[PDB]
Amino acid sequence: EQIAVEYPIPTYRFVVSVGDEQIPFNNVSGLDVHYDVIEYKDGIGNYYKMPGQRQSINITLRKGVFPGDTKLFDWINSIQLNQVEKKDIAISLTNEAGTEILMTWNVANAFPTSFTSPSFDATSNEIAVQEIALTADRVTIQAA
Amino acid sequence: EQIAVEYPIPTYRFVVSVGDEQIPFNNVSGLDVHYDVIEYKDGIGNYYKMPGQRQSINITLRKGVFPGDTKLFDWINSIQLNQVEKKDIAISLTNEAGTEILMTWNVANAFPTSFTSPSFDATSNEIAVQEIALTADRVTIQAA
Amino acid sequence: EQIAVEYPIPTYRFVVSVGDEQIPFNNVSGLDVHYDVIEYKDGIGNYYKMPGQRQSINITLRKGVFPGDTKLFDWINSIQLNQVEKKDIAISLTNEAGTEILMTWNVANAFPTSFTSPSFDATSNEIAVQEIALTADRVTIQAA
Amino acid sequence: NYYKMPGQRQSINITLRKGVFPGDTKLFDWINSIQLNQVEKKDIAISLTN
């Protein structure tokens, strides 16, 4: 008796922190893990398939533009040759009230690689939105 | 108490100036910063990723055609071999009344590379619109 | 006081002349100026960008088929080896009454390269339309 | 017994690439100053900077 049913978490209940500060973002995507496949074949019919080298992480974060707010462009603009400040990102799925954490996506050593300014369209009534693309080392999912 | 909420700036509240004169445009896009990624791998498992070389800026500006107006075509038509007059572009997001600047996009040393004439369609009721593509050196976002 | 506002010219108010005769066309497109970009990089950080060579013009003209009308096919069919009659094309934006010219597009030394016949469709109620493509030397915009 | 040892050191051959600039003839002037076996020998330093 008393069959219990659980539904998946809605995709809009998340919180993003960059470095050690929390930044309200609009969209986060690209938190994928990819492995190459190494194959070896024998003449007698053996076919070996094993995981290969893990690839780097590419993450794109998207948010609107607000007055007196240029932190992302300041981050991308502080690049000198190969020197840049690397930060750890953390995206967490929260409950409805937002007082608890259910799952966490941990991204380590992410630095900016591209910045996209809003498309200024005089014939549109939408909001101006900026985008930034980061390259990181490794992602890890931790259940709280 | 008194939670404060701010909304992003609408995308149509912008003013464009080319050189030292203001030109009413219809659409501005392409103000992106792109960095290459340099990767080095060691046999023991080290994986170094650093920013590479910054890429140039490609910007497209769009506006309608008006009687007795050929400034953009005159600019592109003045090219002799590799000699052309390079100008600085500035796109600023203004407030509602247009009496204040909230954010500015600074583009340095932009010269024309392509001009698109209106597509003359006798079956259309729309306005004739021209387009110009510029190649620049570097873009910078400054918060006013 | 008395703020003056001007609207862009509609795109359907144009007149086309091929050679020295005026031909009623339906659609004209491709009047674009393109320049290549030449780049030179120094070891100390210099990044020179200049315009390169101007590209040739490609123009497509579209119009319906009328009884006893084959001037375009006669033009394209008169090709013998590399010999063909080259003509000048002029597309002008007129006023509402069609008695005054506002803007003019000048095309020099255009010769046909491809002719497209109507797609005969027994299930369609549309008009049969022919198309021609020209290669030219240079396009120039003159304000009247 | 198989003895293997270093031998004589060889000379260095380097090439430099540079664009052509208005009024610039310095490299051709240097190569064009050769008289028989007489030439101005210079030291080249290449440094990786920030």
Side-chain angles (χ1 to χ4, degrees), chain C:
Chain C
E1 296 232 69
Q2 274 240 339
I3 293 101
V5 179
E6 198 163 61
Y7 289 128
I9 304 157
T11 194
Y12 76 99
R13 301 187 182 157
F14 67 99
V15 171
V16 188
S17 41
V18 175
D20 38 43
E21 34 158 11
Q22 311 171 295
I23 302 170
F25 279 100
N26 201 7
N27 181 278
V28 176
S29 98
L31 304 119
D32 303 327
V33 201
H34 287 275
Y35 283 82
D36 271 299
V37 182
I38 306 189
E39 311 186 325
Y40 179 72
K41 280 198 164 142
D42 256 344
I44 59 178
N46 294 323
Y47 193 2
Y48 300 97
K49 321 170 190 64
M50 54 217 100
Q53 275 177 287
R54 198 179 61 218
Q55 301 178 10
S56 59
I57 318 291
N58 281 40
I59 285 173
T60 60
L61 301 110
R62 165 121 56 81
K63 78 176 292 217
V65 301
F66 299 85
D69 188 15
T70 42
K71 288 159 280 273
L72 302 190
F73 184 78
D74 292 356
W75 188 16
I76 189 153
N77 206 29
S78 67
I79 290 181
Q80 303 159 33
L81 204 67
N82 66 335
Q83 290 174 22
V84 69
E85 157 94 1
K86 298 194 177 180
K87 312 202 218 287
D88 303 0
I89 322 284
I91 302 106
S92 297
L93 276 178
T94 89
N95 62 343
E96 197 273 301
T99 63
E100 206 226 358
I101 301 300
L102 301 173
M103 198 153 306
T104 313
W105 279 257
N106 279 280
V107 180
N109 295 332
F111 63 99
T113 59
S114 88
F115 184 91
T116 302
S117 283
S119 96
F120 303 94
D121 192 356
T123 83
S124 172
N125 266 339
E126 294 338 283
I127 51 150
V129 175
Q130 78 204 87
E131 202 201 309
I132 190 170
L134 316 186
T135 289
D137 274 357
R138 172 185 74 290
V139 63
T140 286
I141 311 181
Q142 167 87 28

Side-chain angles (χ1 to χ4, degrees), chain B residues 40-97:
Chain B
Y40 175 75
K41 253 145 149 172
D42 261 345
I44 65 178
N46 286 315
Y47 194 5
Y48 303 97
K49 322 166 191 66
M50 44 218 102
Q53 272 186 288
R54 199 179 65 217
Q55 304 179 13
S56 56
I57 314 294
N58 306 331
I59 283 174
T60 63
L61 300 105
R62 181 118 55 70
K63 83 182 298 218
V65 308
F66 298 88
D69 184 31
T70 41
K71 269 161 315 266
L72 301 189
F73 182 78
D74 283 346
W75 186 17
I76 192 153
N77 204 30
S78 69
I79 297 181
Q80 300 150 42
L81 207 70
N82 63 335
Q83 293 180 24
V84 68
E85 217 264 298
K86 298 194 178 183
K87 306 196 216 287
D88 297 339
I89 325 288
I91 299 102
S92 299
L93 277 177
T94 85
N95 62 343
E96 188 290 274

Side-chain angles (χ1 to χ4, degrees), chain A residues 48-111:
Chain A
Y48 301 96
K49 324 168 192 63
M50 55 218 101
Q53 275 187 108
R54 181 178 82 220
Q55 301 174 15
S56 55
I57 318 291
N58 301 308
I59 285 173
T60 67
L61 303 110
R62 151 129 56 81
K63 80 180 294 218
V65 307
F66 302 89
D69 174 27
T70 43
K71 274 159 298 263
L72 301 191
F73 182 79
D74 291 3
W75 189 15
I76 193 145
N77 200 34
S78 67
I79 291 179
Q80 276 151 59
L81 209 67
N82 62 338
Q83 295 176 20
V84 68
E85 158 93 1
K86 295 189 176 179
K87 312 195 224 286
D88 300 329
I89 325 285
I91 302 108
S92 300
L93 277 177
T94 84
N95 62 341
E96 194 286 89
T99 64
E100 211 221 353
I101 304 299
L102 310 183
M103 206 153 298
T104 310
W105 281 254
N106 272 289
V107 202
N109 294 330
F111 61 99

